[PDB]
Design an enzyme around this catalytic site. Structure first.
Site, mmCIF file in Angstrom:
data_model
loop_
_atom_site.group_PDB
_atom_site.id
_atom_site.type_symbol
_atom_site.label_atom_id
_atom_site.label_comp_id
_atom_site.label_asym_id
_atom_site.label_seq_id
_atom_site.Cartn_x
_atom_site.Cartn_y
_atom_site.Cartn_z
ATOM 1 N N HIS A 1 -6.283 -7.087 0.467
ATOM 2 C CA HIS A 1 -6.822 -6.162 -0.819
ATOM 3 C C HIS A 1 -6.043 -6.043 -1.758
ATOM 4 O O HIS A 1 -5.005 -6.415 -2.415
ATOM 5 C CB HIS A 1 -6.108 -4.966 0.376
ATOM 6 C CG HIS A 1 -6.739 -5.340 2.084
ATOM 7 N ND1 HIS A 1 -6.143 -5.465 3.167
ATOM 8 C CD2 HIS A 1 -8.004 -4.281 2.473
ATOM 9 C CE1 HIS A 1 -6.417 -5.452 4.190
ATOM 10 N NE2 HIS A 1 -7.753 -4.981 3.951
ATOM 11 N N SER B 1 -3.571 -8.613 -9.703
ATOM 12 C CA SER B 1 -3.873 -7.948 -7.730
ATOM 13 C C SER B 1 -5.799 -9.123 -8.162
ATOM 14 O O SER B 1 -6.352 -8.274 -8.810
ATOM 15 C CB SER B 1 -4.835 -6.798 -7.468
ATOM 16 O OG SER B 1 -4.404 -6.879 -5.885
ATOM 17 N N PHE B 2 -5.860 -10.068 -6.872
ATOM 18 C CA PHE B 2 -6.465 -10.331 -6.948
ATOM 19 C C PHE B 2 -7.787 -10.088 -5.298
ATOM 20 O O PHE B 2 -6.192 -9.722 -4.562
ATOM 21 C CB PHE B 2 -7.173 -11.849 -6.350
ATOM 22 C CG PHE B 2 -6.933 -12.486 -7.787
ATOM 23 C CD1 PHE B 2 -4.774 -12.681 -8.230
ATOM 24 C CD2 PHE B 2 -7.611 -13.382 -8.721
ATOM 25 C CE1 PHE B 2 -4.437 -13.852 -8.803
ATOM 26 C CE2 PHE B 2 -7.109 -13.989 -9.356
ATOM 27 C CZ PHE B 2 -5.693 -13.978 -10.363
ATOM 28 N N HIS C 1 0.804 -1.080 -0.537
ATOM 29 C CA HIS C 1 0.094 0.193 -0.107
ATOM 30 C C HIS C 1 0.869 1.625 0.175
ATOM 31 O O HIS C 1 0.749 2.482 -0.336
ATOM 32 C CB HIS C 1 -1.146 -0.092 1.181
ATOM 33 C CG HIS C 1 -1.999 -1.109 1.029
ATOM 34 N ND1 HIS C 1 -2.524 -1.892 0.008
ATOM 35 C CD2 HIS C 1 -2.557 -1.671 2.230
ATOM 36 C CE1 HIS C 1 -3.698 -2.015 -0.157
ATOM 37 N NE2 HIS C 1 -3.400 -2.482 1.202
ATOM 38 N N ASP D 1 -3.166 -10.859 -1.131
ATOM 39 C CA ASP D 1 -3.570 -10.124 -0.266
ATOM 40 C C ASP D 1 -5.056 -10.215 -0.671
ATOM 41 O O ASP D 1 -5.293 -9.809 -1.666
ATOM 42 C CB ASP D 1 -2.602 -8.729 -0.229
ATOM 43 C CG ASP D 1 -3.287 -8.251 1.368
ATOM 44 O OD1 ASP D 1 -3.679 -7.719 1.333
ATOM 45 O OD2 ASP D 1 -2.309 -8.352 2.117
ATOM 46 N N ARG E 1 -8.707 -11.693 11.708
ATOM 47 C CA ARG E 1 -9.633 -10.263 12.401
ATOM 48 C C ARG E 1 -10.172 -9.128 11.539
ATOM 49 O O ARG E 1 -10.497 -8.323 11.596
ATOM 50 C CB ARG E 1 -8.303 -9.785 12.845
ATOM 51 C CG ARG E 1 -9.009 -8.336 14.168
ATOM 52 C CD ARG E 1 -7.612 -8.136 14.680
ATOM 53 N NE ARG E 1 -7.809 -7.021 15.432
ATOM 54 C CZ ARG E 1 -7.038 -6.331 16.566
ATOM 55 N NH1 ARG E 1 -6.118 -6.868 16.328
ATOM 56 N NH2 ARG E 1 -7.561 -5.338 16.758
ATOM 57 N N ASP F 1 -0.429 -10.404 -6.935
ATOM 58 C CA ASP F 1 -0.758 -10.175 -5.419
ATOM 59 C C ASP F 1 -2.124 -11.203 -5.201
ATOM 60 O O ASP F 1 -3.513 -10.609 -5.429
ATOM 61 C CB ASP F 1 -0.849 -8.939 -5.182
ATOM 62 C CG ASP F 1 -1.363 -8.226 -3.596
ATOM 63 O OD1 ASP F 1 -2.514 -7.967 -3.265
ATOM 64 O OD2 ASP F 1 -1.032 -6.713 -4.249
ATOM 65 N N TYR G 1 -2.171 -3.709 -18.823
ATOM 66 C CA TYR G 1 -0.372 -3.834 -18.431
ATOM 67 C C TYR G 1 -0.868 -4.324 -16.999
ATOM 68 O O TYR G 1 0.265 -4.439 -15.644
ATOM 69 C CB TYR G 1 0.335 -4.145 -18.399
ATOM 70 C CG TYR G 1 0.935 -4.237 -20.129
ATOM 71 C CD1 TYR G 1 1.161 -5.533 -20.051
ATOM 72 C CD2 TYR G 1 1.386 -3.183 -21.076
ATOM 73 C CE1 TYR G 1 2.017 -5.354 -21.535
ATOM 74 C CE2 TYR G 1 0.993 -3.694 -22.280
ATOM 75 C CZ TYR G 1 1.646 -5.237 -22.973
ATOM 76 O OH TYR G 1 1.759 -5.364 -23.834
HETATM 77 C C1 LIG Z 1 -4.172 -3.279 5.640
HETATM 78 C C2 LIG Z 1 -4.781 -1.638 6.035
HETATM 79 C C3 LIG Z 1 -6.591 -1.274 6.587
HETATM 80 C C4 LIG Z 1 -6.574 -0.588 6.460
HETATM 81 C C5 LIG Z 1 -7.963 0.281 7.266
HETATM 82 N N1 LIG Z 1 -7.810 1.242 7.400
HETATM 83 C C6 LIG Z 1 -9.375 2.420 7.132
HETATM 84 O O1 LIG Z 1 -9.615 2.036 6.215
HETATM 85 C C7 LIG Z 1 -8.752 3.897 7.337
HETATM 86 C C8 LIG Z 1 -9.936 5.207 6.429
HETATM 87 N N2 LIG Z 1 -9.186 5.556 5.743
HETATM 88 C C9 LIG Z 1 -9.314 7.077 5.549
HETATM 89 C C10 LIG Z 1 -8.198 4.461 5.736
HETATM 90 C C11 LIG Z 1 -7.853 -0.293 8.028
HETATM 91 N N3 LIG Z 1 -8.511 -1.425 8.820
HETATM 92 C C12 LIG Z 1 -8.578 -1.507 10.114
HETATM 93 C C13 LIG Z 1 -7.876 -0.880 10.676
HETATM 94 C C14 LIG Z 1 -7.392 -0.635 11.551
HETATM 95 C C15 LIG Z 1 -6.794 0.681 12.837
HETATM 96 C C16 LIG Z 1 -6.214 1.157 13.937
HETATM 97 C C17 LIG Z 1 -5.067 1.762 14.143
HETATM 98 C C18 LIG Z 1 -4.494 2.141 15.557
HETATM 99 C C19 LIG Z 1 -5.473 0.959 16.346
HETATM 100 C C20 LIG Z 1 -6.384 -0.168 16.439
HETATM 101 C C21 LIG Z 1 -6.712 -0.006 15.105
HETATM 102 N N4 LIG Z 1 -7.362 -0.605 14.347
HETATM 103 C C22 LIG Z 1 -7.937 -0.913 14.051
HETATM 104 O O2 LIG Z 1 -8.929 -1.616 13.436
HETATM 105 C C23 LIG Z 1 -9.330 -2.796 13.630
HETATM 106 N N5 LIG Z 1 -7.435 -0.013 9.950
HETATM 107 CA CA LIG Z 2 -5.004 -8.493 -3.798
HETATM 108 CA CA LIG Z 3 2.210 -2.048 -15.828
HETATM 109 ZN ZN LIG Z 4 -4.056 -6.766 3.381
#
Ligand SMILES: CCCC[C@H](NC(=O)C1CN(C)C1)c1ncc(-c2cc3ccccc3nc2OC)[nH]1
Ligand SMILES: [Ca+2]
Ligand SMILES: [Ca+2]
Ligand SMILES: [Zn+2]
Length: 367
Positions: free
Chosen positions: A172, A191-192, A135, A170, A264, A168, A216
């Site tokens: 995401h 990416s899937f 990311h 993952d 999770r 990818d 591509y």
């Molecule tokens: C794989 C990357 C996932 C990112 C995702 N973030 C978002 O959806 C935010 C909203 N956008 C402006 C970005 C996100 N999903 C869950 C979280 C998350 C962040 C935390 C940061 C500090 C502490 C706890 C957190 N708990 C989380 O989910 C349970 N964050």
């Molecule tokens: Ca992926």
């Molecule tokens: Ca490309």
């Molecule tokens: Zn991920």
């Protein structure tokens, strides 16, 4: 036949801590390592400690200003960088933590060192489970990623490979990697991912690249609950077609474990065998392969996944009964390597899977 595997790991990686309640746990890398050591997989592969990638290696992609900020920011001087933190998206998702820059240097060092080893034809496969932070953007952190080790490793591969294929798995969308190479035909990104009201919000199947890069970039958007059967019936045909049309000379496979059942943050239903089938599929093509980590937030399952995927890379059958290890209690109540899928509904009907596959095949005919 059997391949030479080089594996990267720094014993300090597990000590980096994102903060109380943050889902990203570098400790999962140490659990993975400890589990595969206990299965005796160190006997079959060369284990290397990555070097700490320099600010200079990182600026082969990232801006000088963003890398200077990462090198400078600390929990004790945060109050002085209020404006810079906002600009670079360092905050809640991507917190400032003790040793943040060193964690980026180790994650990146493994991926770049693995690419160098492949370029030198000194290994068939290079593994860096601390890498795969797909990311991160040129001048911005995102989704728990700060430095895009994948983009850096691909740039290293491009010194010796005309065409590099990025895959990818993952949950995401691999947005940072797709964005870096969106306008070039020298990297095809596939990416899937879960798509619809889900982070990062990109990866529509209509996003196919631009300019020289048109056709591509490949995106396979999915709904909640995908299972082994549904994933397996779409992955081998897409990758086979991509291999046929694109003819890459090197591959980078991001093995984010957040696509597993019980994650999770994830909403998929794959087992470790279903996820690892992707590695088996990519391996059959016999091309230089860099295997990377990524997401994965139910840490006992991440350790099981990446241990089994290392065993797959080595063509080594490992018993389902887990051996004793430093984290044995984390694998209860069953203490088995393999996981069972949940009873969650698979929203990806077989017709939907075939339809998206057919739409992607139409784009692949344009190569
Ligand atoms: C794989 C990357 C996932 C990112 C995702 N973030 C978002 O959806 C935010 C909203 N956008 C402006 C970005 C996100 N999903 C869950 C979280 C998350 C962040 C935390 C940061 C500090 C502490 C706890 C957190 N708990 C989380 O989910 C349970 N964050
Ligand atoms: Ca992926
Ligand atoms: Ca490309
Ligand atoms: Zn991920």
């Amino acid at each position: 036949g059997k391949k030479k595997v080089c594996y990267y790991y720094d014993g300090d990686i597990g000590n980096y801590y994102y903060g109380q309640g943050h889902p990203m746990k570098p400790h999962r890398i140490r659990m993975t390592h400890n589990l595969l050591l206990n299965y005796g997989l160190y006997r079959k592969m060369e284990i290397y400690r990555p070097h700490k990638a320099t600010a200079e290696e990182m600026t082969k992609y990232h801006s000088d200003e963003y890398i200077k900020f990462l090198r400078s920011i600390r929990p004790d001087n945060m109050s002085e960088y209020s404006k810079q933190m906002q600009r670079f998206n360092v905050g809640e998702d991507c917190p400032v933590f003790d040793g943040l820059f060193e964690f980026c240097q180790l994650s990146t060092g493994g991926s770049v060192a693995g690419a160098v080893k492949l370029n030198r034809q000194q290994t068939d496969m290079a593994v860096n489970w601390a890498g795969g932070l797909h990311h991160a953007k040129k001048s911005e952190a995102s989704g728990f990623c700060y430095v895009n080790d994948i983009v850096l490793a691909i740039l290293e591969l491009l010194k010796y490979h005309q065409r590099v294929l990025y895959i990818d798995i993952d949950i995401h969308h691999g947005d940072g990697v797709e964005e870096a190479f969106y306008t070039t035909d020298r990297v095809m990104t596939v990416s899937f991912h879960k798509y619809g009201e889900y982070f990062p919000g990109t990866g529509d199947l209509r996003d196919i690249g631009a300019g020289k890069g048109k056709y591509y970039a490949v995106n396979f958007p999915m709904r909640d609950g995908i299972d082994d059967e549904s994933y397996g019936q779409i992955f081998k045909p897409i990758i086979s077609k991509v291999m046929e049309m694109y003819q890459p000379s090197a591959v980078v496979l991001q093995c984010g474990a957040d696509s597993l059942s019980g994650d999770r943050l994830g909403c998929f239903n794959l087992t470790v065998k279903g996820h690892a089938k992707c590695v088996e599929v990519v391996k059959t093509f016999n091309l230089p392969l860099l295997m990377l980590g990524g997401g994965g937030y139910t840490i006992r399952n991440v350790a099981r996944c990446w241990t089994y995927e290392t065993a797959v890379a080595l063509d080594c059958e490992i018993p389902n009964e887990l051996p004793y290890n430093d984290y044995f209690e984390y694998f209860g109540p069953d203490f088995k390597l393999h996981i069972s899928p949940s009873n969650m509904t698979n929203q990806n009907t077989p017709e939907y899977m075939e339809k998206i596959k057919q739409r992607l095949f139409e784009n692949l005919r344009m190569l």
